[PDB]
């Protein structure tokens, strides 16, 4: 029965009923079932599997990393009622063997447990003679190269579906990669497991992306204009930044304050406590709490999607209207390219480096909707065009080139979704290369059929189809349509680019 969690749900969080697509996620792990489950931070998705923890028989056990954010997730639980306890190699030994006689006599509801200690091969014996209900990856995406923080430990986890295949795995996210998402799957095998999308949306939250110009004037002009004594978070790249820009506010009235990993420990608790606790104060920040917060400005560009997204989500958690505002230039992507060139990283995270910037890129330069185009990076699709974006409001000039993508996308289809961007526009052009030749390319009927163009459009508008996921590269240089190629090839979507 599916209301036995409903009681617990009250009994304990005080919530009457499940949110958006909670109510299906805890039935599906409480059942025994496997599960992918992407949402924003929150007891929301902690719900996920403690309450499911609660309905099944036996211990929870929660992969996580946070070994240090750890030990209040137990004091929050251990008053509501819930029994639950952590097992890491921060832990005296006789601490560490108490923890594992409660485990074992089923003493536990929640046992929480740094990876490190699970993946030993002894506490992998425990497990088998312990009563357990199920596994919960929380932070799945670590196991990936590609979503946040790798880790070598995470991608072991492959061993929770062996030698526990008759146990529930739900492993959850709230960074939903697109190539992130695809690796989850196949390190936990939940590639045949259902994959649950909470919304990442934040209705109240109005996003505007803009050209930088005098962003200290676009700034002040902005904040007077439209949250003249109101409390906001204003993002800065560096320390300087922050500085500087916090003294200029206080100098023309507004009372800012500089926020960053630098000064000393006690005015960074008393600059949270004179955001947290009065009025209409400002802080500047690099990259680092408020019911009542009114805007987010954002005077360089964030380092992701994931970034942008977390800081944005700052604002308005009072569900009042609250403006996100951005600008960036010029020189911003042109320092940023620099460092990615300049960096001594590993070739895979220059790899991730590069499209989380395409990413970020492709977001702000949108044609339509920027709220779709958001939400879509995490796996969300919005129906409609939200009306709440700048982009919505003051819909900017477009070209469209509905007509040319749909062409493009049947070029790399009745070549069997292989060939590279040069190759495609090849065929696209009706040019009788001789690798075109080698495969016969010259005369199926699409050869040639974009000859209208040039070599220079063409390759535009796959990298557009490209970014916006209606081809997939990571073939190397090879495009494969993906399924949202649907969209414009039958369903009437559009593909416009600013007219710029
Ligand atoms: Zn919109």
Same mark, same amino acid.
């Given at each position: 029965?599916?209301?036995?969690?409903?009681?617990?749900?009250?009994?304990?969080?005080?919530?009457?009923?499940?949110?958006?697509?909670?109510?299906?996620?805890?039935?599906?792990?409480?059942?025994?079932?496997?599960?992918?489950?992407?949402?924003?931070?929150?007891?929301?998705?902690?719900?996920?599997?403690?309450?499911?923890?609660?309905?099944?028989?036996?211990?929870?056990?929660?992969?996580?990393?946070?070994?240090?954010?750890?030990?209040?997730?137990?004091?929050?639980?251990?008053?509501?009622?819930?029994?639950?306890?952590?097992?890491?190699?921060?832990?005296?030994?006789?601490?560490?063997?108490?923890?594992?006689?409660?485990?074992?006599?089923?003493?536990?509801?929640?046992?929480?447990?740094?990876?490190?200690?699970?993946?030993?091969?002894?506490?992998?014996?425990?497990?088998?003679?312990?009563?357990?209900?199920?596994?919960?990856?929380?932070?799945?995406?670590?196991?990936?190269?590609?979503?946040?923080?790798?880790?070598?430990?995470?991608?072991?986890?492959?061993?929770?579906?062996?030698?526990?295949?008759?146990?529930?795995?739900?492993?959850?996210?709230?960074?939903?990669?697109?190539?992130?998402?695809?690796?989850?799957?196949?390190?936990?095998?939940?590639?045949?497991?259902?994959?649950?999308?909470?919304?990442?949306?934040?209705?109240?939250?109005?996003?505007?992306?803009?050209?930088?110009?005098?962003?200290?004037?676009?700034?002040?002009?902005?904040?007077?204009?439209?949250?003249?004594?109101?409390?906001?978070?204003?993002?800065?790249?560096?320390?300087?930044?922050?500085?500087?820009?916090?003294?200029? /506010?206080?100098?023309?009235?507004?009372?800012?304050?500089?926020?960053?990993?630098?000064?000393?420990?006690?005015?960074?608790?008393?600059?949270?406590?004179?955001?947290?606790?009065?009025?209409?104060?400002?802080?500047?920040?690099?990259?680092?709490?408020?019911?009542?917060?009114?805007?987010?400005?954002?005077?360089?560009?964030?380092?992701?999607?994931?970034?942008?997204?977390?800081?944005?989500?700052?604002?308005?958690?009072?569900?009042?209207?609250?403006?996100?505002?951005?600008?960036?230039?010029?020189?911003?992507?042109?320092?940023?390219?620099?460092?990615?060139?300049?960096?001594?990283?590993?070739?895979?995270?220059?790899?991730?480096?590069?499209?989380?910037?395409?990413?970020?890129?492709?977001?702000?330069?949108?044609?339509?909707?920027?709220?779709?185009?958001?939400?879509?990076?995490?796996?969300?699709?919005?129906?409609?065009?939200?009306?709440?974006?700048?982009?919505?409001?003051?819909?900017?000039?477009?070209?469209?080139?509905?007509?040319?993508?749909?062409?493009?996308?049947?070029?790399?289809?009745?070549?069997?979704?292989?060939?590279?961007?040069?190759? /495609?526009?090849?065929?696209?052009?009706?040019?009788?290369?001789?690798?075109?030749?080698?495969?016969?390319?010259?005369?199926?009927?699409?050869?040639?059929?974009?000859?209208?163009?040039?070599?220079?459009?063409?390759?535009?508008?796959?990298?557009?189809?490209?970014?916006?996921?209606?081809?997939?590269?990571?073939?190397?240089?090879?495009?494969?349509?993906?399924?949202?190629?649907?969209?414009? /090839?039958?369903?009437?979507?559009?593909?416009?680019?600013?007219?710029?």
């Amino acid at each position: 029965l599916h209301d036995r969690a409903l009681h617990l749900l009250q009994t304990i969080w005080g919530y009457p009923a499940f949110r958006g697509v909670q109510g299906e996620i805890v039935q599906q792990v409480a059942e025994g079932g496997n599960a992918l489950v992407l949402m924003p931070t929150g007891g929301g998705k902690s719900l996920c599997y403690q309450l499911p923890s609660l309905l099944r028989p036996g211990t929870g056990i929660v992969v996580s990393p946070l070994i240090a954010l750890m030990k209040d997730q137990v004091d929050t639980l251990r008053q509501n009622g819930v029994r639950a306890a952590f097992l890491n190699s921060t832990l005296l030994p006789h601490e560490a063997r108490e923890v594992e006689d409660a485990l074992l006599r089923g003493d536990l509801d929640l046992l929480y447990v740094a990876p490190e200690r699970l993946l030993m091969p002894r506490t992998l014996d425990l497990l088998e003679r312990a009563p357990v209900a199920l596994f919960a990856i929380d932070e799945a995406h670590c196991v990936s190269q590609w979503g946040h923080d790798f880790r070598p430990e995470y991608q072991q986890l492959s061993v929770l579906a062996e030698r526990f295949p008759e146990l529930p795995r739900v492993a959850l996210t709230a960074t939903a990669d697109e190539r992130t998402r695809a690796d989850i799957k196949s390190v936990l095998r939940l590639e045949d497991a259902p994959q649950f999308v909470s919304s990442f949306d934040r209705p109240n939250i109005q996003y505007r992306v803009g050209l930088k110009d005098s962003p200290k004037t676009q700034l002040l002009h902005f904040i007077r204009e439209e949250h003249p004594g109101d409390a906001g978070i204003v993002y800065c790249l560096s320390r300087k930044s922050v500085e500087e820009t916090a003294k200029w /506010l206080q100098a023309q009235g507004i009372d800012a304050l500089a926020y960053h990993a630098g000064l000393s420990s006690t005015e960074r608790n008393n600059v949270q406590e004179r955001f947290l606790n009065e009025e209409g104060v400002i802080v500047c920040a690099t990259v680092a709490d408020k019911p009542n917060v009114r805007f987010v400005a954002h005077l360089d560009l964030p380092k992701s999607m994931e970034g942008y997204y977390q800081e944005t989500g700052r604002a308005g958690r009072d569900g009042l209207p609250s403006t996100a505002w951005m600008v960036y230039g010029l020189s911003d992507v042109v320092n940023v390219r620099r460092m990615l060139a300049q960096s001594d990283a590993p070739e895979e995270v220059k790899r991730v480096e590069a499209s989380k910037l395409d990413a970020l890129l492709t977001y702000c330069e949108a044609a339509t909707c920027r709220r779709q185009v958001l939400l879509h990076y995490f796996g969300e699709e919005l129906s409609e065009p939200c009306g709440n974006c700048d982009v919505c409001l003051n819909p900017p000039r477009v070209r469209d080139l509905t007509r040319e993508a749909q062409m493009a996308l049947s070029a790399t289809i009745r070549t069997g979704n292989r060939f590279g961007a040069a190759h /495609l526009t090849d065929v696209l052009l009706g040019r009788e290369t001789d690798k075109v030749l080698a495969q016969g390319h010259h005369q199926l009927p699409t050869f040639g059929v974009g000859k209208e163009h040039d070599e220079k459009l063409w390759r535009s508008v796959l990298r557009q189809l490209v970014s916006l996921g209606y081809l997939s590269a990571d073939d190397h240089f090879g495009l494969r349509a993906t399924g949202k190629s649907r969209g414009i /090839l039958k369903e009437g979507q559009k593909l416009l680019l600013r007219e710029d």
